[model samples]
Target: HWGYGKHNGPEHWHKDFPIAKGERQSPVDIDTHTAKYDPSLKPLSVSYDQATSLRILNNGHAFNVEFDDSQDKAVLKGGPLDGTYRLIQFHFHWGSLDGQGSEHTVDKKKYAAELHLVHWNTKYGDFGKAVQQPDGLAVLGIFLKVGSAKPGLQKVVDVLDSIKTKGKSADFTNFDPRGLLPESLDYWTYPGSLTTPPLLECVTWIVLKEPISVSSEQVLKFRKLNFNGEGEPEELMVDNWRPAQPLKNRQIKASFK
Candidate 1:
């Protein structure tokens, strides 16, 4: 029921979902200088099966590529995680203008966009059940900048026109999510909640240091998406990202020096 309008946005979410005011809320600013360098942090291990990628949908809030997590066909291990986290879905957040969209910022600088690869802990056995626990989720955050056209992103962009309206979905499969990642696996880790409500505090935020490239043309497609469904007044799906939350007493651990 919550949307990104002036009255129903992030600032008002606390009235309905109390956890929005929780200490570990997500999309926090990543201050690199203050982050702790953890020698014990392991390199990220990501293994995704293209066949496991299911369909793409415009859920109003964002467009998502859903994966089949029924089996460990695609999983993320190591990198600040104790157990394997299976990939369930991947989505993006952007703004109406360039250099202002991303949810999490680095040194107060926003990127053109942000990508979230959502995974749930396999140890919990079920995503729904896991989302209620402290260590239930692991989200990989990648910043997107305007540069050369990303070939891997073309597949996703090509389908955006079909699902431009909310509640619309298209059959999408055999896509490998790894193609969207940058060369470096370096990241900052911390405890946080879902950027959206019910704003569950079950995630281990893994924000990458290296940003992936996307062309300005590709980003324009994202702005074409509508947040409202058929018959409703069209609202462009831009500026859908949440602002950074308080870090509270959390320590951001870095995998690399």
Candidate 2:
């Protein structure tokens, strides 16, 4: 079960999971009122490739993925693809039950949960090493909301039964995460850090303006994933999301035109 209140929530996750302390965090408040308007902030480019080597893991949390990075590419400045980016991992942030638990805060409102697609700049050679370099990370954020129906994400949901135990991950090969990308290509871009531990401050965040919907049943299944470390199976790992933080003085820019 999830913790009862504020301190019991994700904000206090570090107390239970020290690993969270080093992770870069998200949901920093975006104050549109004071945000500056700049056309240049638009994405210089966008690209998506078929992910053929996608693998899923039960890993005691939720259904997460370790993607085949070699097949991905990115575009830049409406010109020849500037460089390649590799898809590293993808995970979600959900609530205790099915009510709420997303990482991003828009005008003080929180969604059900958030999904992060992590990628690394190929200029650094490999993801393991690139993660240590500045300007080496990119994350695509997606929001999940509670509803009564499915919204195309069932492909992932169907595999839950395969790896229902802790640390049990399957070679969920031949899947494409791109299928989950929202129809809206419009997004917001900003310079920030990872939303997890090691809180690396060198990521370029590309968050979609639109969210994808999944059924309430799907949300319940996700909550069933194991959370505690190995050998701690009895610990119910329901909620594993970080609370939103202040954006400080950072400016959030979007591309909608």
Candidate 3:
């Protein structure tokens, strides 16, 4: 059983994932303990679309998904950011335990989990080409707080029964990610990078001001994944989040107004 290992834990993620070097990370203590900062920024635009094909894959990681390129790309049109962008992927960050699942922090607070709606600048052929560009990525962050049971998730979770045997997945057709968005689309945005391997510095982060609630049981269901790939059940996959780093003179803007 492999517990949250040194290279596996958030503290050692930068070293393990060299791409994260010099890139803005998540779960940062928003330092709200201080005084007023600046005026609020407004969202350029909030685009929406339905997803066509959604399939779950083992990819040696937990249950990762491969989304079709048919969904609408919500370009946060006008903001402090330079160009418009489109939605690419929607994924999650969770903890082994139920209490701590979120990846981003607001003044040192930890939520249950965080969902990221990844997007890229369409000017570059497709997302694949955009990944290599400086102004090519945008990720909408949604916090998942523990609360009442949510039937909304059932659409995605019910499929788990089919792929629960590890290294397994099923055809998840007719899935629409837009339905997963929280009621509050207004967000706080900033220039950042991907939170995973090869942490590219081409991301435009759009973190929602509000969060959605899910039951504790739902959080526990995700703990079964192996974050470290150590092949140990005891080494629960809790705390798969990286700690928040300095904004490094980079101004964080919001989309509310």
TM-score per candidate, in order? Answer: 0.98, 0.81, 0.81
| Greater-lDDT candidate between 1 and 3 | 1
lDDT score of model 1?
0.93
Error of 2 at 13 (Å): 7.2
Question: Which is the winner by lDDT between candidate 2 and candidate 3?
Answer: 2
RMSD value for candidate 2: 4.3
User: How many pairs collide in each candidate, listed in order?
Assistant: 0, 12, 13
Residue 225 CA error for candidate 1 (Å)?
A: 0.3
Please state the error at residue 206 of candidate 1 in Å. Answer: 0.6
For 1-257, candidate 3 gives per-residue lDDT tens digits of 21236745445556656666574654355544332333544444655554454686543334555566544534445554566676655667777655676767776677878887777776776887887877787777888888876666766666655555446678886666666667876666677777665667777777776888778777767666544333435344456566677766566555444
lDDT of 1 by residue, 104-168 (tens): 99999999999999999999999999999999999999999998988899999999999989999
Stretches of candidate 2 above 4 Å error? Answer: 1-25, 42-46, 60-62, 71-83, 229-233
Q: Which stretches of candidate 3 lie over 4 Å from their true place?
A: 1-4, 13-19, 32-44, 70-84, 165-167, 227-236
TM-score, predicted candidate 2 vs. hidden true structure: 0.81
Q: Write model 2 residue lDDT over 1-257, tens digit each, in one string.
A: 22424545556556655544443445565555544455655343545555554578765545577866664543222211135567777888788865567777666667787888777878888877777765677777888878645555776777776666667777777666767777776666666676655456657777777888888888777766665555664555556666665565567776654
| RMSD, one per candidate, in order | 0.9, 4.3, 3.6
